[PDB]
Enzyme design. Structure first.
Site, mmCIF file in Angstrom:
data_model
loop_
_atom_site.group_PDB
_atom_site.id
_atom_site.type_symbol
_atom_site.label_atom_id
_atom_site.label_comp_id
_atom_site.label_asym_id
_atom_site.label_seq_id
_atom_site.Cartn_x
_atom_site.Cartn_y
_atom_site.Cartn_z
ATOM 1 N N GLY A 114 -1.680 -28.584 14.969
ATOM 2 C CA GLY A 114 -1.877 -29.988 15.286
ATOM 3 C C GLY A 114 -0.587 -30.620 15.773
ATOM 4 N NE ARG B 250 1.749 -26.470 -0.726
ATOM 5 C CZ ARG B 250 2.809 -26.022 -0.061
ATOM 6 N NH1 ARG B 250 3.663 -25.182 -0.636
ATOM 7 N NH2 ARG B 250 3.020 -26.416 1.188
ATOM 8 C CB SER C 115 0.639 -39.980 12.085
ATOM 9 O OG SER C 115 0.701 -38.698 12.695
ATOM 10 C CE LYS D 64 2.721 -24.434 10.433
ATOM 11 N NZ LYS D 64 1.508 -24.154 9.616
ATOM 12 C CB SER D 65 8.556 -30.301 10.524
ATOM 13 O OG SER D 65 7.334 -30.550 9.851
ATOM 14 N NE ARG E 113 9.680 -33.019 14.798
ATOM 15 C CZ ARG E 113 8.460 -32.720 14.363
ATOM 16 N NH1 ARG E 113 8.171 -31.493 13.946
ATOM 17 N NH2 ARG E 113 7.520 -33.657 14.342
ATOM 18 C CG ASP F 158 3.164 -31.082 1.094
ATOM 19 O OD1 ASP F 158 1.957 -31.131 1.424
ATOM 20 O OD2 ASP F 158 4.004 -31.670 1.813
ATOM 21 N NE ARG G 215 -3.150 -28.577 -2.835
ATOM 22 C CZ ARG G 215 -2.147 -28.255 -2.022
ATOM 23 N NH1 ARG G 215 -1.107 -29.067 -1.874
ATOM 24 N NH2 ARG G 215 -2.184 -27.110 -1.351
ATOM 25 C CE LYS H 7 -9.464 -45.427 0.856
ATOM 26 N NZ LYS H 7 -8.050 -45.572 0.411
#
EC number: 2.5.1.19
Length: 427
Positions: A92, A385, A166, A20-21, A25, A312, A343, A339
């Site tokens: 995002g 997942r 980030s 995805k990243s 790009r 992930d 999952r 915190k």
């Protein structure tokens, strides 16, 4: 649905969906470069489709034809003013990265998205960009979408220390420094996604890098490249775990992403004693052929520094640890809710209903011994997942029947997941 149980062998050659990243790009770098850019095996999601349309509104010629993306480059200062407000949708990445791309744009733009995107703050990106000379503001003090941007031809270089870990803020400043006049340094708080640093070197860019400190000169001119998007390791890890776990099995995965900040699963398999083969390494795009066969696994410790590289991949690691001999402990992992975590508990409830021991912890989980899995009823609860983890866990079940409710959620990242598994059983 009733999942496939009691599998004797798993064989075949698989090509997983793109990262995805890198897919995001490839459109950004392809537009900013000079010449033609051809993208192969792109991730066909709505977030990547949103970025493609945004640049198309800015005047960049992008052709989506037969799974091949052809981008005609406009240059570093070749973007034009859009006719209307730019739709970013749910992405995002799109809203944050392009905000830094339009830093040297001599016009006014409007960037908006959906309800999920509008709830997320953009103050972490607007603060450093304002110091450069870009006029950006959103809703309230935390700058919520929609945002209004007006760039400058006289962009100032930036010396910024990132308060948050980030990659989206880090990459946004790198695209802005590529337009700015002078030397700009960007310091990371922690080691994060470095896909922007890899694609910069690909398109003919230059950087130094001094252990967290990223130095970038400007302005820079780039050249159009032949881009083959590496497969997502998150999607590939489901097959890498299943190959080691299923009896009399061997699976080959062609060109899977091999970026350092995301290869936490490989370090786990290596430590456990898994027969993982790495061939045909692409050094420029960071991708390699991954072959995996049936192996006997042992318990290992997964703690600090390793966690952000496999955050992930945690669900299937617990399934991989379930068939490992001994005790495997996961610690330094509390981010399932800033915190909190839910999952790990869902992974626990689903797996120990099928086989032996899994115990949740405040900062991770403890898995113990090789387990003989049997049939159970598992609900995904809107998670992709969990559904894919239960599907590959079902192949080991010989007695009972594994039933999966809400199995439609798997199509979020892997639409051809069951089609790929079907070819592996009969392969």
């Amino acid at each position: 649905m009733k999942l496939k149980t009691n599998i004797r062998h798993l064989h075949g050659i698989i090509r997983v969906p793109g990262d995805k990243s890198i897919s995001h790009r490839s459109i950004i770098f392809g537009s900013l470069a000079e010449g033609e850019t051809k993208v192969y095996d792109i991730l066909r999601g709505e977030d990547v489709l949103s970025t493609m349309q945004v640049f198309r509104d800015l005047g960049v010629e992008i052709e989506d034809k037969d799974g091949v993306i052809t981008v005609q480059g406009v240059g570093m200062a070749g973007l034009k003013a859009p006719q209307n407000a730019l739709n970013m949708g749910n992405s995002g990445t799109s809203i944050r990265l392009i905000s830094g791309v339009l830093a040297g744009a001599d016009f006014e733009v409007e960037m908006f998205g959906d309800d999920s995107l509008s709830k997320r703050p953009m103050d972490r990106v607007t603060l450093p960009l304002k110091k450069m000379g870009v006029s950006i503001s959103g809703q309230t003090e935390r700058d919520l979408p929609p945002l209004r941007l007006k760039g400058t031809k006289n962009l100032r270089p930036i010396h910024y220390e990132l308060p948050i870990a980030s990659a989206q803020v880090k990459s946004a400043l790198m695209f802005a420094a590529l337009q700015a006049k002078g030397e700009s340094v960007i310091i990371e708080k922690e080691y994060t996604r470095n896909h922007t640093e890899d694609m910069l070197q690909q398109f003919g860019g230059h950087l130094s890098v001094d252990g967290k400190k990223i130095t970038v000169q400007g302005p820079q001119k780039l050249t159009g490249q032949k881009v083959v998007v590496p497969g997502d390791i998150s999607s590939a890890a489901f097959w890498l775990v299943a190959g080691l776990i299923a009896p009399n099995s061997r699976l080959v995965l062609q060109n899977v992403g091999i970026n350092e900040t995301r290869t936490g699963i490989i370090d786990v398999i290596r430590a456990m004693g898994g027969k993982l083969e790495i061939t045909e390494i692409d050094p420029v795009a960071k991708s390699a052929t991954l072959i995996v066969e049936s192996s006997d696994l042992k318990g290992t410790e997964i703690c600090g520094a390793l966690i952000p590289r496999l955050i992930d991949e945690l669900p299937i690691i617990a399934l991989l640890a379930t068939q490992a001999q001994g005790v495997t402990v996961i610690k330094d992992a509390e981010e399932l809710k800033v915190k909190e975590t839910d999952r790990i508990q869902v992974v626990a409830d689903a797996l120990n209903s099928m086989g032996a021991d899994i115990t949740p912890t405040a900062d991770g989980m403890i898995i113990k011994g090789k387990s003989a899995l049997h049939g159970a009823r598992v609900n995904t609860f809107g998670d992709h997942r969990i559904g894919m983890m239960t599907a590959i866990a079902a192949l080991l079940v010989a007695d009972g029947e594994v039933e999966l409710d809400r199995a439609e959620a798997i199509n979020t990242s892997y639409p051809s997941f069951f089609d790929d598994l079907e070819s592996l059983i009969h392969g």
